[PDB]
A paper describes a structure:
Since most proteins are diamagnetic, spin labels such as MTSSL are routinely attached to the surface of proteins via site-directed spin labelling techniques. Whereas one of the conformations fits to calculated rotamer libraries the second conformation does not, illustrating how the environment of the label can force it to adopt a conformation which is less favourable for the free label.
Due to the crystal-packing environment in the triclinic crystals, the label is observed in two different but fully ordered states. Henceforth, the R1 conformation found in monomers I and III will be referred to as R1-I/III. In monomers II and IV, the R1 side chain lies at the heart of a crystal contact and is involved in numerous van-der-Waals (vdW) interactions and a hydrogen bond between the nitroxide oxygen and an ordered water molecule. For this R1 conformation (from here on referred to as R1-II/IV) PISA calculates a solvent accessible surface area of 260 Å2, 171 Å2 of which are buried. In monomers II and IV, the crystal-packing environment precludes the R1-I/III conformation due to steric constraints. Interestingly, the nearby K128 side chain rotates from the position found in monomers I and III by 180° to accommodate the R1-II/IV conformation. Comparison with the rotamer library reveals that χ2, χ4 and to a lesser extend χ5 of R1-II/IV adjust to values that are less favorable for the free label.
Residue numbers in the entry:
A (entry chain D), B (entry chain C), C (entry chain A), D (entry chain B): 1 to 128
Write the structure that this text describes.
């Protein structure tokens, strides 16, 4: 509640939120991702990935090419501020990151990088 | 155009887009597939195949079992909403299908069924 | 040199030889596999896998089902006499196996089990 | 028997002849190929392919690369004087060719172009 959000990615290619605001007074912020539904990771895998709005396209593009065994993320992608693993239905993953990595006024996007998902599974993140 | 999309599958085993939007005010939608590159068709052949997300795995698995002879598609597969032929380098093929075949509340995936290709060659199709 | 062979699998989905001879007077035989080219493992990965001709199809079918994370080989597959790891471009791997595992009168095939690859990446191994 | 020969290719990668002599008084010559054994075409396919000795390596190499659905022969290969289709166990095929295509004094080879078989399955053909 204070410094975390719980997010679900389902079999209908939806996150159950499209907007996050991180309280600047949190030292760290945590996203707890889960995957209701029944489809497997190779058909309906979801991650939660954070970048600047400007970097989203390249993160998604390079991620899609990286393949499932790399969680559809380019390894060591410096544009990725934080991310969960790619999960299938019934799996879960959390990611915690340092709030100092964000700056007020900058535009951030969160999204899933499974091929074709970012067009449907994305939202804004703000720091206040 | 308003009722079609151009898509490329290349010799890096990628499509050049992974998300398609079909405008519900179209009667029909056309996918124009092309194949930049130069590898033989029996090495890097591509098609564009559409099914629901729930059906994708079966279409791909049965498709590979069907062999090159059958363009890696199970003949008269009822799960396949639309598909192009399998093409090699420098070739083109288009498929047109009725938008009435889609519903606003369903999840669709497009993909190549050549063995192993769907690892990267897959994406979403959404009716809006 | 008398008890080993160097073999390459390339970006054209070919091995650079399709017939290997194993000298009966060798106690052990070594295959040194390399991968000229530049495609990544998840597009054009190769291994070198040995079975009887009669087991080849079953090994290839089950290997495909096993996934890239298993190097496209069924775990503990009793039909695989010997195998390298799966490698991408610029990588190499060797396997050594006891020549006593080969029997006179039997027919052997080597092949890559990456999806679709065995179509062209297959060959014979003969004990002399 | 004066203008034909029956040849078997078995599960042991052997033809049952290593040498053919075509009587030049024949207008045409026929090879009747059969495949004793149990193994199917995809792991133990055999064809009977005729070229000059000088052309054999290129025919075999390009044949390999062409795949099972092309009977492991390059389409319209001008170096191929005559060929059967590729057969598996229990199957049969015959080819007839004009004897005028052959020159007395020239060296010819017959062989199977299934990957790795030509090293084991080849012989000479002479016109007299
Ligand atoms: Cu997703
Ligand atoms: Cu493809
Ligand atoms: Cu391979
Ligand atoms: Cu053969």
């Amino acid at each position: 509640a204070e410094c975390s959000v719980d997010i679900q990615g389902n079999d209908q290619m939806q996150f159950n939120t499209n907007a996050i605001c991180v309280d600047k007074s949190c030292k760290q912020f945590t996203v707890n991702l889960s995957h209701p539904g029944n489809l497997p990771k190779n058909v309906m895998g979801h991650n939660w990935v954070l970048s600047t709005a400007a970097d989203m396209q390249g993160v998604v593009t390079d991620g899609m090419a990286s393949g499932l065994d790399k969680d559809y993320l380019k390894p060591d992608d410096s544009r990725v501020i934080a991310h969960t693993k790619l999960i299938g239905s019934g799996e879960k993953d959390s990611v915690t990151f340092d709030v100092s990595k964000l700056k007020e006024g900058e535009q951030y996007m969160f999204f899933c990088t499974f091929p074709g998902h970012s067009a449907l599974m994305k939202g804004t993140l703000t720091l206040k």
